[PDB]
Design an enzyme around this catalytic site. Structure first.
Site, PDB file in Angstrom:
ATOM      1  CG  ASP A  35      88.142 -56.211  12.908  1.00 36.03           C
ATOM      2  OD1 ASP A  35      88.104 -56.215  11.666  1.00 36.03           O
ATOM      3  OD2 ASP A  35      88.872 -56.980  13.566  1.00 36.03           O
ATOM      4  CB  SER A 199      87.012 -57.587  -6.869  1.00 37.54           C
ATOM      5  OG  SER A 199      87.203 -56.550  -7.810  1.00 37.54           O
TER       6      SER A 199
HETATM    7  N1  LIG Z   1      90.547 -57.252  10.720  1.00 40.61           N
HETATM    8  C1  LIG Z   1      90.609 -58.573  11.322  1.00 40.61           C
HETATM    9  C2  LIG Z   1      91.420 -59.533  10.457  1.00 40.61           C
HETATM   10  C3  LIG Z   1      92.806 -59.489  10.468  1.00 40.61           C
HETATM   11  C4  LIG Z   1      93.528 -60.371   9.677  1.00 40.61           C
HETATM   12  C5  LIG Z   1      92.860 -61.285   8.881  1.00 40.61           C
HETATM   13  C6  LIG Z   1      93.633 -62.264   8.007  1.00 40.61           C
HETATM   14  F1  LIG Z   1      94.971 -61.987   8.081  1.00 40.61           F
HETATM   15  F2  LIG Z   1      93.389 -63.533   8.452  1.00 40.61           F
HETATM   16  F3  LIG Z   1      93.204 -62.139   6.718  1.00 40.61           F
HETATM   17  C7  LIG Z   1      91.478 -61.330   8.871  1.00 40.61           C
HETATM   18  C8  LIG Z   1      90.758 -60.450   9.657  1.00 40.61           C
HETATM   19  N1  LIG Z   2      92.681 -56.353  12.404  1.00 41.58           N
HETATM   20  C1  LIG Z   2      92.308 -56.124  13.788  1.00 41.58           C
HETATM   21  C2  LIG Z   2      93.321 -55.170  14.423  1.00 41.58           C
HETATM   22  C3  LIG Z   2      92.979 -53.847  14.648  1.00 41.58           C
HETATM   23  C4  LIG Z   2      93.903 -52.983  15.219  1.00 41.58           C
HETATM   24  C5  LIG Z   2      95.161 -53.443  15.568  1.00 41.58           C
HETATM   25  C6  LIG Z   2      96.180 -52.490  16.193  1.00 41.58           C
HETATM   26  F1  LIG Z   2      96.116 -51.288  15.545  1.00 41.58           F
HETATM   27  F2  LIG Z   2      95.917 -52.296  17.520  1.00 41.58           F
HETATM   28  F3  LIG Z   2      97.428 -53.027  16.046  1.00 41.58           F
HETATM   29  C7  LIG Z   2      95.502 -54.767  15.338  1.00 41.58           C
HETATM   30  C8  LIG Z   2      94.580 -55.629  14.766  1.00 41.58           C
END
Ligand SMILES: NCc1ccc(C(F)(F)F)cc1
Ligand SMILES: NCc1ccc(C(F)(F)F)cc1
Length: 330
Positions: A35, A199
């Site tokens: 992630d 972008s």
């Molecule tokens: N994949 C992690 C993640 C999930 C949500 C956000 C948000 F909503 F803050 F943009 C950033 C990073």
């Molecule tokens: N952005 C991070 C994240 C990754 C996976 C999930 C899930 F799939 F488990 F819901 C939630 C949040």
């Protein structure tokens, strides 16, 4: 040193991608969601509330000869989708595709939200944003990338996600056989802790390219593409019968429609997302309404270049002293 690992979609919709990670001595292999939108390495473990575990592989620190409890350290994280988890912290040895880091903070989940319990295929997350976002208290911890940086041949990792197919995360080197043409690099702001870039615009299908700065984050941890309302309205206006549904919570379209592609700008270069990538199938089993992979960021507060966008490209996360993002067609 370098490392290379295969990442595989968890379901037929590419909702997420899992990558095997070795933790502890002897190795315990867990399938983690890499992630780039977060900075915590946390796993289901022998400490997770038993009713909140439904099929996941758990990390057992009591069976690792290299595991050390980090006295008094706790963690608690909330994601942009409302998911959350929390627990305590260990240090242990962690290897990804032959690349090893000793003394990596492994955050053992004591409590996980329902969305994690219901995803039997994800054993945890491996955060690859910047370490300033790590939630370990009272002593912040470094990510796996940050800990490995010094030993890597080059302080980079690359994301090569597949469309309905396995892909690759590489650490320490850029595979020049994995992409076509040239890599276009663009400046990154770390001020919010994300891989945040700008972008240079977009196009819908064969339409005229619209030059306009779109600020957003490169997030392997997010499934869809989230862009400003004006852009997303311009896209779905080209799909007959598409509309925004409040009950469904997004744009939907007739499953019989053909979707146009979506182009986004990286400097002077263009990344083209095929229309098939934007189809996320029926909103419910048997339905003839399908869910769209390009949605509005208005309710989020930031634009997210999630998997829908990133799997259309070879992406370089350059963790040099001045970090940059690299995009190439493939
Ligand atoms: N994949 C992690 C993640 C999930 C949500 C956000 C948000 F909503 F803050 F943009 C950033 C990073
Ligand atoms: N952005 C991070 C994240 C990754 C996976 C999930 C899930 F799939 F488990 F819901 C939630 C949040």
């Amino acid at each position: 040193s370098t490392g290379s690992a295969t990442t595989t979609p968890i379901d037929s919709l590419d909702d997420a991608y899992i990558t095997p990670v070795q933790i502890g001595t002897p190795a315990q292999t867990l399938n983690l969601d890499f992630d780039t939108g977060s900075s915590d390495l946390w796993v289901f473990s022998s400490e997770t509330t038993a009713s909140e575990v439904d099929g996941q592989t758990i990390y057992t620190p009591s069976k690792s000869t290299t595991a050390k409890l980090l006295s008094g350290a706790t963690w608690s994280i909330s994601y942009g989708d409302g998911s959350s988890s929390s627990g305590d912290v260990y240090t242990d040895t962690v290897s990804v595709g032959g690349l090893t880091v000793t003394g990596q903070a492994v955050e053992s989940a004591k409590k996980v939200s329902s969305s994690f319990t219901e995803d039997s295929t994800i054993d945890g997350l491996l955060g690859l944003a910047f370490s300033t976002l790590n939630t370990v208290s009272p002593t912040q911890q470094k990510t796996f990338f940050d800990n490995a940086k010094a030993s890597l041949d080059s302080p980079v990792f690359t994301a090569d996600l597949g469309y309905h197919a396995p892909g690759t995360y590489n650490f320490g080197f850029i595979d020049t056989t994995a992409y076509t043409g040239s890599i276009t690099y663009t400046a990154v702001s770390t001020k919010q802790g994300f891989w945040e870039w700008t972008s240079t615009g977009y196009a819908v299908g064969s339409g005229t390219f619209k030059s306009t700065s779109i600020d957003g984050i490169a997030d392997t941890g997010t499934t869809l593409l989230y862009l400003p309302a004006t852009v997303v309205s311009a896209y779905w206006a080209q799909v007959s019968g598409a509309k925004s549904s409040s009950s469904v919570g997004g744009y939907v379209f007739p499953c019989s429609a053909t979707l146009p592609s979506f182009t986004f700008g990286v400097g002077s270069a263009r990344i083209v997302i095929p229309g098939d990538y934007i189809d996320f199938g029926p909103i419910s089993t048997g339905s003839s309404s399908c869910f769209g992979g390009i949605q509005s960021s208005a309710g989020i507060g930031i634009n997210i270049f999630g998997d829908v966008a990133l799997k259309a490209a070879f992406v370089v996360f350059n963790g040099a002293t001045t970090p940059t993002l690299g995009f190439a067609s493939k």
